[PDB]
Coordinates of C-alpha atoms in Angstrom, one line a residue:
Chain A
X1 CA -18.7 -19.7 -48.8
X2 CA -16.0 -17.1 -49.4
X3 CA -17.3 -13.9 -47.8
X4 CA -18.8 -16.3 -44.9
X5 CA -15.1 -17.6 -44.6
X6 CA -13.8 -14.0 -44.5
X7 CA -16.5 -13.6 -41.8
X8 CA -15.3 -16.7 -40.0
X9 CA -11.7 -15.2 -40.1
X10 CA -12.9 -12.0 -38.7
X11 CA -14.6 -13.9 -36.0
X12 CA -11.3 -15.5 -35.2
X13 CA -9.5 -12.0 -35.3
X14 CA -12.0 -9.9 -33.2
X15 CA -12.6 -12.5 -30.2
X16 CA -8.9 -13.4 -30.1
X17 CA -7.5 -9.9 -30.1
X18 CA -10.3 -8.7 -27.7
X19 CA -9.6 -11.2 -24.8
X20 CA -6.0 -9.6 -24.5
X21 CA -7.0 -6.1 -23.3
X22 CA -9.1 -6.8 -20.3
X23 CA -6.9 -10.0 -20.2
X24 CA -4.3 -7.8 -18.8
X25 CA -6.2 -5.1 -17.3
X26 CA -8.2 -7.0 -14.9
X27 CA -5.0 -9.0 -14.0
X28 CA -3.0 -5.7 -13.1
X29 CA -6.4 -4.8 -11.2
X30 CA -6.7 -8.1 -9.5
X31 CA -2.9 -7.8 -8.4
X32 CA -3.1 -4.2 -7.0
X33 CA -6.4 -5.1 -5.7
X34 CA -5.2 -8.0 -3.4
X35 CA -2.1 -5.8 -2.7
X36 CA -4.6 -3.1 -1.3
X37 CA -6.5 -5.8 0.7
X38 CA -3.5 -7.0 2.1
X39 CA -2.3 -3.5 3.2
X40 CA -5.9 -3.2 4.5
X41 CA -8.2 -6.0 4.9
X42 CA -10.5 -3.8 7.3
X43 CA -12.5 -2.2 4.4
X44 CA -12.5 -5.6 2.4
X45 CA -16.4 -5.8 2.0
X46 CA -16.7 -2.6 0.2
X47 CA -13.3 -3.7 -1.5
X48 CA -14.8 -6.8 -3.0
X49 CA -18.0 -4.7 -3.6
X50 CA -16.0 -2.4 -5.9
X51 CA -14.0 -5.4 -7.1
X52 CA -17.2 -6.9 -8.6
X53 CA -18.3 -3.8 -9.8
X54 CA -15.0 -3.5 -12.0
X55 CA -14.8 -7.1 -12.9
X56 CA -18.0 -7.0 -14.4
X57 CA -17.2 -4.2 -16.9
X58 CA -13.9 -5.8 -17.4
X59 CA -15.3 -9.0 -18.5
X60 CA -18.2 -7.4 -20.5
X61 CA -15.6 -6.6 -23.5
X62 CA -14.5 -10.3 -23.6
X63 CA -18.1 -11.3 -23.6
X64 CA -19.0 -8.7 -26.4
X65 CA -16.0 -10.2 -28.4
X66 CA -17.3 -13.7 -28.2
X67 CA -20.8 -12.2 -29.0
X68 CA -19.4 -10.6 -32.3
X69 CA -17.5 -14.0 -33.0
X70 CA -20.7 -16.0 -32.6
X71 CA -22.5 -13.2 -34.9
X72 CA -20.1 -13.8 -37.5
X73 CA -20.2 -17.6 -37.2
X74 CA -24.1 -18.2 -37.2
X75 CA -26.1 -14.9 -37.2
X76 CA -24.1 -13.2 -40.0
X77 CA -26.6 -10.9 -41.8
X78 CA -24.0 -10.0 -44.5
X79 CA -23.1 -13.8 -45.2
Chain B
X1 CA 14.0 11.5 54.1
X2 CA 15.1 14.9 54.7
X3 CA 17.2 14.7 51.6
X4 CA 16.8 14.0 48.0
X5 CA 17.7 11.3 45.5
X6 CA 17.2 10.3 41.9
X7 CA 14.2 8.6 40.5
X8 CA 14.6 7.2 37.1
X9 CA 12.4 4.4 35.8
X10 CA 13.3 3.2 32.3
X11 CA 10.1 4.1 30.8
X12 CA 9.2 1.9 27.7
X13 CA 6.7 2.6 24.9
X14 CA 5.0 0.5 22.5
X15 CA 6.1 -0.4 18.9
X16 CA 2.8 0.4 17.3
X17 CA 3.8 -1.0 13.7
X18 CA 2.1 2.6 13.1
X19 CA 0.3 1.6 10.0
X20 CA 0.4 -0.8 7.1
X21 CA -1.8 1.4 5.2
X22 CA 0.3 4.7 5.8
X23 CA 1.8 5.3 2.4
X24 CA 5.4 6.6 2.2
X25 CA 5.5 9.7 -0.2
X26 CA 9.2 9.5 0.1
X27 CA 10.5 5.8 -0.4
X28 CA 11.4 4.6 3.1
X29 CA 14.9 4.2 2.3
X30 CA 15.0 7.8 1.6
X31 CA 12.8 9.2 4.5
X32 CA 14.8 7.6 7.3
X33 CA 18.0 9.6 5.7
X34 CA 16.2 12.8 7.1
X35 CA 14.6 11.1 10.3
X36 CA 18.1 10.0 11.4
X37 CA 19.4 13.7 11.9
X38 CA 16.2 14.0 14.1
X39 CA 17.4 11.0 16.2
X40 CA 20.7 12.8 16.5
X41 CA 19.3 16.0 17.6
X42 CA 17.1 14.4 20.2
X43 CA 20.0 12.4 21.5
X44 CA 22.3 15.3 21.6
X45 CA 19.8 17.4 23.5
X46 CA 18.9 14.7 26.0
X47 CA 22.6 14.2 26.6
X48 CA 22.9 18.2 26.9
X49 CA 20.4 18.5 29.4
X50 CA 21.3 15.3 31.3
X51 CA 24.8 17.0 31.7
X52 CA 23.2 20.1 32.8

């Protein structure tokens, strides 16, 4: 409809503008992480463990943005 | 013998590449500017005592 079309535009905007944030922070994090692992590959196991522990909470925001986009696409309880 | 001589062996020591993970709080183009006075003083003291 019309309010549903505005909800679809909001679904575009939300998941579009969400992915840049972690999509830059996790990249800076990955660069500094590989720099740390290069200056010390000895602690690499706990390094990658902390890397996964950060990467999950990194990608969770883009996952929630895609979820809000789907919740405006199909599961829109206001439209 | 009944007399004395000099014993000088060119004693070497390693290049440890001390640590990749050692951090430079003063920007290694900057810390050397003060480390080199130390090399100067050590060389001048070794020359002083070699003269003595």
